[PDB]
Write an enzyme that holds these catalytic residues in place. Sequence first.
Site, mmCIF file in Angstrom:
data_model
loop_
_atom_site.group_PDB
_atom_site.id
_atom_site.type_symbol
_atom_site.label_atom_id
_atom_site.label_comp_id
_atom_site.label_asym_id
_atom_site.label_seq_id
_atom_site.Cartn_x
_atom_site.Cartn_y
_atom_site.Cartn_z
ATOM 1 N N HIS A 185 5.549 0.368 -18.325
ATOM 2 C CA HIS A 185 4.750 1.070 -18.990
ATOM 3 C C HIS A 185 5.818 1.924 -19.249
ATOM 4 O O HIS A 185 6.736 2.135 -18.668
ATOM 5 C CB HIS A 185 3.687 1.308 -18.462
ATOM 6 C CG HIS A 185 3.767 2.403 -17.382
ATOM 7 N ND1 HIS A 185 4.057 3.174 -17.226
ATOM 8 C CD2 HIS A 185 2.800 2.177 -17.040
ATOM 9 C CE1 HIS A 185 4.322 3.070 -16.047
ATOM 10 N NE2 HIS A 185 3.677 3.141 -15.952
ATOM 11 N N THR A 200 0.037 1.451 -14.733
ATOM 12 C CA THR A 200 0.599 0.554 -13.720
ATOM 13 C C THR A 200 -0.544 -0.896 -12.976
ATOM 14 O O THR A 200 0.271 -1.773 -13.213
ATOM 15 C CB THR A 200 1.343 0.861 -12.706
ATOM 16 O OG1 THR A 200 2.018 2.803 -12.406
ATOM 17 C CG2 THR A 200 1.772 0.172 -11.146
ATOM 18 N N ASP A 224 9.745 5.677 -12.531
ATOM 19 C CA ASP A 224 8.574 5.900 -12.614
ATOM 20 C C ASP A 224 8.195 7.367 -12.048
ATOM 21 O O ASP A 224 7.913 8.449 -11.790
ATOM 22 C CB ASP A 224 7.198 5.099 -12.520
ATOM 23 C CG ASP A 224 5.580 5.481 -12.666
ATOM 24 O OD1 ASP A 224 4.876 6.104 -13.747
ATOM 25 O OD2 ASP A 224 4.981 6.297 -11.452
HETATM 26 C C1 LIG Z 1 -4.647 -9.870 -5.545
HETATM 27 C C2 LIG Z 1 -4.132 -9.971 -4.445
HETATM 28 O O1 LIG Z 1 -4.301 -10.974 -3.478
HETATM 29 N N1 LIG Z 1 -4.903 -8.682 -3.627
HETATM 30 C C3 LIG Z 1 -4.304 -8.870 -1.855
HETATM 31 C C4 LIG Z 1 -3.058 -8.202 -2.102
HETATM 32 C C5 LIG Z 1 -3.927 -6.518 -2.286
HETATM 33 C C6 LIG Z 1 -2.793 -5.595 -1.720
HETATM 34 C C7 LIG Z 1 -2.436 -4.927 -0.054
HETATM 35 C C8 LIG Z 1 -1.555 -4.504 -0.076
HETATM 36 C C9 LIG Z 1 -0.565 -3.725 -1.032
HETATM 37 N N2 LIG Z 1 0.422 -2.598 -0.867
HETATM 38 C C10 LIG Z 1 0.910 -2.149 -2.185
HETATM 39 C C11 LIG Z 1 0.376 -2.052 -3.260
HETATM 40 C C12 LIG Z 1 1.207 -1.406 -4.584
HETATM 41 C C13 LIG Z 1 2.398 -2.914 -4.562
HETATM 42 O O2 LIG Z 1 2.635 -3.315 -4.673
HETATM 43 N N3 LIG Z 1 2.361 -2.330 -6.810
HETATM 44 C C14 LIG Z 1 2.048 -0.242 -7.098
HETATM 45 C C15 LIG Z 1 3.030 -3.297 -7.445
HETATM 46 C C16 LIG Z 1 2.801 -4.301 -7.603
HETATM 47 C C17 LIG Z 1 3.191 -5.522 -8.186
HETATM 48 C C18 LIG Z 1 2.566 -6.168 -8.343
HETATM 49 C C19 LIG Z 1 1.114 -6.435 -8.135
HETATM 50 CL CL1 LIG Z 1 0.530 -8.016 -9.954
HETATM 51 C C20 LIG Z 1 0.652 -5.130 -8.846
HETATM 52 CL CL2 LIG Z 1 -1.020 -5.151 -9.425
HETATM 53 C C21 LIG Z 1 0.717 -3.716 -8.251
HETATM 54 C C22 LIG Z 1 -0.461 -3.296 -3.385
HETATM 55 O O3 LIG Z 1 -1.228 -3.566 -4.654
HETATM 56 N N4 LIG Z 1 -1.139 -3.422 -2.672
HETATM 57 C C23 LIG Z 1 -2.206 -4.245 -2.580
HETATM 58 C C24 LIG Z 1 -4.510 -6.402 -4.105
HETATM 59 C C25 LIG Z 1 -5.517 -7.071 -3.551
HETATM 60 CA CA LIG Z 2 3.423 1.935 -13.399
HETATM 61 ZN ZN LIG Z 3 3.053 6.595 -13.598
#
Ligand SMILES: CC(=O)N1CCC(c2ccc3ncc(CC(=O)N(C)Cc4ccc(Cl)c(Cl)c4)c(=O)n3c2)CC1
Ligand SMILES: [Ca+2]
Ligand SMILES: [Zn+2]
Length: 805
Positions: A309, A159, A261
Amino acid sequence: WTATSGSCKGRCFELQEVGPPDCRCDNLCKSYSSCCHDFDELCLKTARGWECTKDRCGEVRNEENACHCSEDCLSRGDCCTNYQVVCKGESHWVDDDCEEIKVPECPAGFVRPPLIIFSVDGFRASYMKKGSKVMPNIEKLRSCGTHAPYMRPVYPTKTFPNLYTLATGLYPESHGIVGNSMYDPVFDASFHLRGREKFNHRWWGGQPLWITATKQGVRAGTFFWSVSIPHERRILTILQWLSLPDNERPSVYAFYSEQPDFSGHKYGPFGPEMTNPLREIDKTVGQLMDGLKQLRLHRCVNVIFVGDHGMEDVTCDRTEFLSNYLTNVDDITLVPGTLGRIRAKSINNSKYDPKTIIAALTCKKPDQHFKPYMKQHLPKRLHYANNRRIEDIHLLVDRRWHVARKPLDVYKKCFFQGDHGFDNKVNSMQTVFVGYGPTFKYRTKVPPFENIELYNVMCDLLGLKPAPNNGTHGSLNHLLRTNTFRPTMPDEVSRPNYPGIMYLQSEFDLGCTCDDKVENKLEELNKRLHTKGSTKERHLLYGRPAVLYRTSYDILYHTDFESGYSEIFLMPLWTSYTISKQAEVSSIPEHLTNCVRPDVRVSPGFSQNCLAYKNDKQMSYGFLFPPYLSSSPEAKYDAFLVTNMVPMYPAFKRVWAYFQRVLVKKYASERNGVNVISGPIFDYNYDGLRDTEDEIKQYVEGSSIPVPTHYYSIITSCLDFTQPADKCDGPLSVSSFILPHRPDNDESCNSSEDESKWVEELMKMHTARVRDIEHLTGLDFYRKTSRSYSEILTLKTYLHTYESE
Ligand SMILES: CC(=O)N1CCC(c2ccc3ncc(CC(=O)N(C)Cc4ccc(Cl)c(Cl)c4)c(=O)n3c2)CC1
Ligand SMILES: [Ca+2]
Ligand SMILES: [Zn+2]
Ligand SMILES: *[C@@H]1O[C@H](CO)[C@@H](O[C@@H]2O[C@H](CO)[C@@H](O[C@@H]3O[C@H](CO[C@H]4O[C@H](CO)[C@@H](O)[C@H](O[C@H]5O[C@H](CO)[C@@H](O)[C@H](O)[C@@H]5O[C@H]5O[C@H](CO)[C@@H](O)[C@H](O)[C@@H]5O)[C@@H]4O)[C@@H](O)[C@H](O[C@H]4O[C@H](CO)[C@@H](O)[C@H](O)[C@@H]4O[C@H]4O[C@H](CO)[C@@H](O)[C@H](O)[C@@H]4O)[C@@H]3O)[C@H](O)[C@H]2NC(C)=O)[C@H](O)[C@H]1NC(C)=O
Ligand SMILES: [Ca+2]
Ligand code: NA
Ligand code: NA
């Protein structure tokens, strides 16, 4: 510390995150446990559910309700998404006939069509057909918009690496999110699925689309969502943001679903329990589309429906254990499951040895369900090596299997029935792409493409200049009605020399011999014409490759092949030749077995020498244009020119000789002729980019002849195979490979067998895009065709995957 006694009144799902210790009200506050005390009460209303009913129509507004069915809800931007259907006699979006969206039909004050990215986790490509009867809204998006039969994720097919690839256009090795779990030895810090280290910005490189937009004056928040916000509230939040005043309203939005998923891991990709999650995601799409229709935005917004994926059948019983191979299993750390990454448990243990670990894991068991690689030896198409967070030792796991360190890891953790992460060419790992809206085409099917290409398209949809990325901008222009990007071909940096005959035989002291002394004005002028380029239009079908860096090289013409010969690397950068369907294969004649011939167009100082090969007991040589495919016994002599010779380990010559003797002719037979361009690649720092001279780690002993890390071939023919490769009027067809130039065949567990049982299997594993070879060589191919440049860019991104339907 968070001072949670501030308030979310008037701030629910605010777009600008407020700084600590002030309490937050944005869509990520739950992830940080930092929401204001009244976030649930104010921002996560649930009263009376998510749908209008007849009795609620024209109700007196009650601010406690999750959504509204009062007369004022349209102006407030907070109706339940089915409000107009239930209360105003309107149809659901899914029930309307599709009608082409020729131009954006947007409300006043909209500066551009907004972009909504609807990301579905674990949405396997084949769900679009297999689940179609239970997904009417998604089926309408797919059939009416632009869709691919599948979209290729990046490796690993997990993911976080894929969603961040979608947002940046970068391979995981370049954006830094190389797995769902990582250790960075420079930081001395670990990134995990569960926890907060993963929120630190130092992990996340590149420039994601929301930052690209914001920098260029286009409003966009991050695409993340806290898991506890229900999907219906995510959709209502998006619709409320779309109701903001013009100067406050974002132009790009992201919805994420953890399904299918989550269920796929429990039930397998096609478990009977999977129908319900597909129905539920479809119903969420329908909430969004009905909501847009309410706002009169359903023929204004571009919607992308995309997965990260797919999902494969994987159960606990299909686990290989490293404790069944290794003595020292307690001295390693393994990142496990559908891929393996190994490093030393302690950096203080100087008895840790990668060589011994690899050897203990190589072809040890007859049906072994993983293969070990040093990361530089992984297929180059995975682009999975140039990051300190990727351990040197990698295990490529077979589809349907896991690897783990010890059995107790698997039962002191059977539950699960699905997983993903495998090689990104695996069919079960493929995912989905649909684009629907005014800027996408209508009722259009596009060929499968890679997710690294989408960031540039999203930038085109938004009028943004993309940050530097790994897409090939223009290769997806055929998805778009308008806003296409019209790239120009890169400029050639180095122009070739075209040497004539400038040296006598006796000027050479290369230690080479050839029985070629066996001696007509009819055919003497004819051989002169061949050396000046008379057959060049036959063998160079798409123009000479352009050299995109500063170097010294010569074009050499011959009856059967043309080459660009590097004076710096002492060998061709490329060698181009066409083999018709009617070509005959011949032998190397006995008297010519060890023949190498000085080339009187190229100075002894810029030539290889045979003495170096005699002395280097590890290294032999091969030829780029194969002597087996000479057009006549006389033309065969050109194939033994020292300017056609390349260094080859004997183990690699088994591979190369079978390709040249057997497989090229097979391809010419099957494809109605083929044009082949072959050459060396030097990538000793495994960055996917051409090495400069001073990066070369290995030479033929005692010489300046550099040893390639890989050999490529690009094999082109007519897509309409009724026309011969050399007389093709329309689109082309390509397959290519980047074979590792290794001193053993340890990668091929069946290499003791005849080449007919293992070489093509090796080649398929190392299939490549023409663009991958472009990065690795600094060459630009297909410069002179009859085709549009965007069509050629699509061709250069094609990967032949060798998977079934
Ligand atoms: C790089 C940046 O600006 N950061 C500041 C925020 C930080 C961050 C804080 C909170 C947070 N809460 C939940 C998820 C789960 C999620 O959202 N998902 C699984 C979907 C998802 C949607 C789009 C993308 Cl690109 C991805 Cl990789 C995953 C997550 O990842 N979080 C992340 C990460 C670093
Ligand atoms: Ca995934
Ligand atoms: Zn998975
Ligand atoms: C896929 O697309 C991407 C994007 O186009 C391609 O990647 C680019 O490739 C370039 C060449 O490899 C590279 O350009 C170099 O950048 C250096 C400055 O880097 C910083 O700034 C940029 C721009 O904002 C930023 O994006 C970088 O981000 C990287 O690093 C941070 C943290 O370290 C990460 O969070 C992030 O994920 C990213 O990591 C990735 O890239 C780095 C390399 O930059 C890798 O090490 C990681 O493993 C990971 O893959 C940076 O924050 C700049 O300093 C370079 O210049 C040096 O090299 C040239 C050679 O031309 C030399 O002439 C110069 O003098 C200089 O050398 C000096 O430093 C050397 C090292 O210490 C030293 O040995 C010398 O003796 C000298 O002192 C160079 O221009 C660019 O950064 C990346 N960008 C990204 C985002 O990855 C990628 O190639 C494409 N892939 C394919 C296969 O086509
Ligand atoms: Ca390199
Ligand atoms: Na030798
Ligand atoms: Na072998």
